[PDB]
Amino acid sequence: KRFEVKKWNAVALWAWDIVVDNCAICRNHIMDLCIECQANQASATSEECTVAWGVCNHAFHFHCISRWLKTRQVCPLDNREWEFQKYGH
């Protein structure tokens, strides 16, 4: 051949079993609102109902784990202190 690849420097991103189809706290989805918001509008009045990403690569609705912080303080699928490293998908 005329051109051949010798080295590769790909970067691999990983995500845990967040179950994009069932929120691990509310069991609706990784998007499309939550149990306490339901309808899309539901008198939104600004604020937000996006996805929250932790330091453990877990994803839930911001509302779900914001409320869950009052019940416990360690991400339910593990035993790690939950951070708020990202907001939204």
């Binding site: 051949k1 005329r2 051109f3 051949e4 690849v5 010798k6 080295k7 590769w8 420097n9 790909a10 970067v11 691999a12 991103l13 990983w14 995500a15 845990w16 079993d17 990403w53 932790g54 330091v55 690569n57 951070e83 490293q85 990202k86």
Partner: protein, 130 residues
């Protein structure tokens, strides 16, 4: 600044440490199997979604067959050793060293021109439509 965002930077450095450790581990494990001629040289890293934002929309395009096989190998190895590290497929990151051939001069592709040049290798005289 204080221990507000510097903690995030320390976490990013920890992620860098994790990435290089996983890279050397995957190189050691590649030294073991050696099935196909696609893993000749592999400097592949492992990052977490939270630390590094997604580039645009995670590009998903035709990858070259040898690099494609190499990435498959990497994904499998990771999901087995560090079970839970499902490698997503992206293209807007990384680089590569293309060995061209009067001497043998090695080019460099930043994971963008690899597919186009591989298509040229498969068949020259292409255009935008191809």
């Amino acid at each position: 600044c204080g221990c507000q965002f510097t903690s995030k930077l320390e976490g990013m450095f920890r992620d860098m440490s994790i990435s290089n450790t996983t890279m050397d581990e995957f190189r050691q494990h590649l030294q073991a199997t050696g099935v196909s001629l696609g893993g000749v040289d592999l400097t592949v890293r492992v990052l977490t979604t939270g630390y590094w934002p997604t580039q645009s929309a995670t590009p998903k395009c035709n990858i070259p067959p040898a690099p494609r096989h190499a990435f498959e190998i990497f994904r499998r190895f990771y999901l087995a050793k560090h079970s839970g590290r499902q490698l997503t497929l992206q293209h807007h990151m990384g680089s590569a060293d293309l060995n061209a051939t009067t001497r043998k001069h090695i080019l460099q592709v930043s994971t963008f021109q690899m597919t186009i040049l591989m298509l040229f290798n498969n068949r020259e005289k292409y255009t935008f439509e191809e």
